[PDB]
Amino acid sequence: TIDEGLYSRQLYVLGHEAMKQMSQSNVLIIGCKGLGVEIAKNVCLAGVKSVTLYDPQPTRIEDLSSQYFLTEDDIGVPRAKVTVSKLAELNQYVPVSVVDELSTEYLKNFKCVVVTETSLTKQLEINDFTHKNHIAYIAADSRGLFGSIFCDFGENFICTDTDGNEPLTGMIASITDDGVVTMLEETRHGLENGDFVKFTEVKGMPGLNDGTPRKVEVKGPYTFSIGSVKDLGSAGYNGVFTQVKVPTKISFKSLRESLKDPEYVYPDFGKMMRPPQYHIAFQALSAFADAHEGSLPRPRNDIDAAEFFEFCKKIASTLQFDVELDEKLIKEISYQARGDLVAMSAFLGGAVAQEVLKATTSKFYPLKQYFYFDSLESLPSSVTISEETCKPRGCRYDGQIAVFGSEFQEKIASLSTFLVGAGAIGCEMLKNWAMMGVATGESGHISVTDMDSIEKSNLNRQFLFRPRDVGKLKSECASTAVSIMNPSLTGKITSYQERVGPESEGIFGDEFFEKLSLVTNALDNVEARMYVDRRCVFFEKPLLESGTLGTKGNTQVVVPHLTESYGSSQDPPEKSFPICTLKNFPNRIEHTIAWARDLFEGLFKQPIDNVNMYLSSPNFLETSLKTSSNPREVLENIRDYLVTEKPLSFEECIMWARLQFDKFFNNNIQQLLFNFPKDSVTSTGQPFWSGPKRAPTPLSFDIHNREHFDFIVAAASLYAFNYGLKSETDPAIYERVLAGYNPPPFAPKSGIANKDKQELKSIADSLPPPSSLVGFRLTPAEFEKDDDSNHHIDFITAASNLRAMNYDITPADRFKTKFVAGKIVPAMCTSTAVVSGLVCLELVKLVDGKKKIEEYKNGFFNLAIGLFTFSDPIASPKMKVNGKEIDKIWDRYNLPDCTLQELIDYFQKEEGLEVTMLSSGVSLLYANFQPPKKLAERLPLKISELVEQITKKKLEPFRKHLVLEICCDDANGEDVEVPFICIKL
Amino acid sequence: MQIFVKTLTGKTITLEVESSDTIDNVKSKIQDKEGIPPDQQRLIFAGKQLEDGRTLSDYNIQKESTLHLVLRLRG
Amino acid sequence: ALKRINRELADLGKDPPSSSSAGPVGDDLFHWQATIMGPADSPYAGGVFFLSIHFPTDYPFKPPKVNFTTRIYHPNINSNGSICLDILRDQWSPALTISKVLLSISSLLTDPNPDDPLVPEIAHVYKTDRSRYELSAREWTRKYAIG
Ligand SMILES: Nc1ncnc2c1ncn2[C@@H]1O[C@H](COP(=O)(O)OP(=O)(O)OP(=O)(O)O)[C@@H](O)[C@H]1O
Ligand SMILES: [Mg+2]
């Protein structure tokens, strides 16, 4: 009874069984500061059985530095009581409660226990009991720019899936008697030594088809070994190998035992000596807090730092840690002990939420065991950081001023950012900006633009939207929510509903872009990302790109004149199958799904478009006759959908659906088998239907079968929708009509002047004149995956399953069909939180105006295996032009609106280069091979007039510049790249 | 004897070979003359693709036969 | 994008293909009308075939859309002019050039591949009755590729 209308995107990451097992586990959360509330939000969105909170401390002002459910009217009230009311509205299936006091035995009521903002002694006391009762225990701590996570899931943890990937499967060419398994030509299995696989459909070696997993010895990228197959046979031909994923046993240690001899996880190999430092540092922090009634060292205080360093020395001596303590790092930890940043809190909350999901679902590889992280490179260097500047001012930004100071806070308050998109990443970025006080000053401003509307499936990871807000614009709702969270941002936020593209340049023009400070992308398509990147490059504004895919995520920062752009590197491609495979010989369910999608487009979309365009364009037939690739096909479609097969009731739609079923599933297969019989051989003598090619078999229509009836119903419903008729779903009418159907005979055909134009004309004139049919339009079927009442995914699933039955392929259910056909990108809330945290950690670097390139870090992470990596951005390539250093990306030529001849003369005389090609937009303004008449006609014209003449469209009033791409050759004719030209209108 | 190999660009290469010469030797001559690796040479005669390990006589290649040199593409 | 397109165009201009000529439509770089000459040692000898090339906005990250315009009787070419080649579907690296695309197309016309056909009936005729295939190809290249 999983609510598939809400967990649609998450179920593609976790699965049905994972969520079924997750919906029976209770989670307790001790500590309700920023990290605790973030973890609670993520867990509630995840869909656990219930959530319990425990934080009886009264609210204070500084606690609002990272809490977004607390207001200044809540000072003095326990955090849990004022937080549960707002947390209960995130998910309706996840009850949230509060416990005033905590007892040890009560801990047995929960499946996972998260501990934050707790002393080390209490953590040890809790762990000594939660370890021997097999309860997952996750302890998190966030001090300034440092974070620590500790996980303990018992001594007999069972991990079903250790990487989250699908089992590797592939085809086999030949298997020798020595266990040498060989793939097909230029086919790499991708297995690793120690993996287990099972073989099926192996010809000549039936023994390997039993299904028993066997060890794998990798011998090369194309072959491997399994051992000895002497008994089973001599040589095996063809077959499929499939990887088998086995459960693993992971054994942890208690907190008390792991304190002496911990097991670190290193997020970066450039700084390998730090985690040992953090292990001592956090224990010393706890000891100092215990020695000052829970009072952390004051910000940038020398005496407290010295005492903390003494405690660090004492602990290091006590534990016999053979590591030299770094005094500078320890004193920095002491200074920022009272820090409370929203970016670090969000990052650690996402990580801990993912760990909780791993613990509950027994999936993915967890942390083992300690994880110490720091972002000390984010510390501002352009402002004076001292005890005087970092002292609290009794405001809600004290937790951040205590790290960065008042001057950097004022710098943040005057930012002018631009957020593209208002999805989940946009919502997280807006929350972080609201917490940080971005654009709360006099000169600050925030602009957010997004044209999409809130849907039901977006509420799973977008916490700023509520079910009552379904169907409204994202930007307005987000702006209202974040203005409610921070009242100081009333009137400082502008929400647009415009798609960022070539058609929105009239609003987001030069005037708009000259006041921005940075651009943050929250998009989901590559074209818009690359357009925004081009715009940022033109205006030279810092850009923040972030992308997620399931549990993987990456963040990149583009800085003017320092790093290369984001469009300069386009790694991730897509896959489009060869047409011969899809059209005739499929061998996987994806092929059938693609074929079904193409069939849907060709049956319900293109013919309707042709019919509608015929009745609108007065000269449609003549244009199509000399423009369309297949005028004959268009004419046939128009005739069939207008006169030949125009339905007058739903029964005729059912008959048409049956006829199409027969056409596509019974006749084409017979034709193919007549052309290529099952006993046919290739040119080399090998059997034709062997290997990737599977012998098909025609299907006979059986009404009692579920799939045939589903296909008939879906096709009839779609046809009726196209013709605007009244559809029915009662099987009685279908069984009554389909009984009286006479299948037309069909026998395969072996085959064996300029009248074609005459035949096409005869077909054309048969069509009724457009004047005869006025106001008669057919409704095209626009594909919509999210709607479950239009029979789209049902029809696609039915067609794919029928085609799979044609080729004896394994059918897929509606869930996977919707995943594949709809191009749904898996998404998670934890990944969104992590990428938002990383982007906001880069944002403080950007604000400080750091100049070196080694101080920025593009980040990548995979939460399935707990992998985190950070690398320096790639510097923008340089070049030598006219004996000068030119940046390839961030340099341009600024010229007036001079004539083309004057531009050529300028490039010939100044740069000493000969212009050979000059283009703008999608037009070729000037080329060296054009006829001399055309050039002489175009030379004495200005650039603006030339563009207007070529593009046949006047320049709009808001346009103020032109971007020209110029390719020029040197004196010797050697091609040399030059930066683009920025013509100023 | 003599044979003619036509390339994809319209060029005609004349070779001095013997009916007993192996396909490997012909691919070697084509690599020596044009610099095309043997792995990428697809030699065709009378609608049949020449395979390594055999001789010209196996394909009934005689005086002034014409072969085709194309790239290894399949699909 | 535009820069790579013009670099390839200049390379075509400087290096004469001698059997093909690809050029943009009017002054649009995202639409070319190329020409291919029928191979001499093929039934399609003495024929001119026109191709339409639509460059995607993500070129060269995505393969160009190349579609035949002149009707041709080939086992691996359907009626709609669609072509059957890997370098257009998933073998499209950023290293390919229309130059080579055309080379490939020509090599295909030189020798068909009936083991993995796109038109099953023509492939069957070619495999069974070679003479009928030769006659049909000659008739088609005379009716469409000539004049
Ligand atoms: N060209 C564009 N201009 C403006 N906003 C855009 C553009 N393209 C995408 N977006 C916005 O980017 C966000 C993408 O986020 P996300 O993919 O999570 O949302 P969605 O597409 O609505 O959901 P789903 O992926 O679950 O179907 C959406 O807010 C969408 O409106
Ligand atoms: Mg949407």
Ligand SMILES: [Mg+2]
């Ligand atoms: Mg989306």
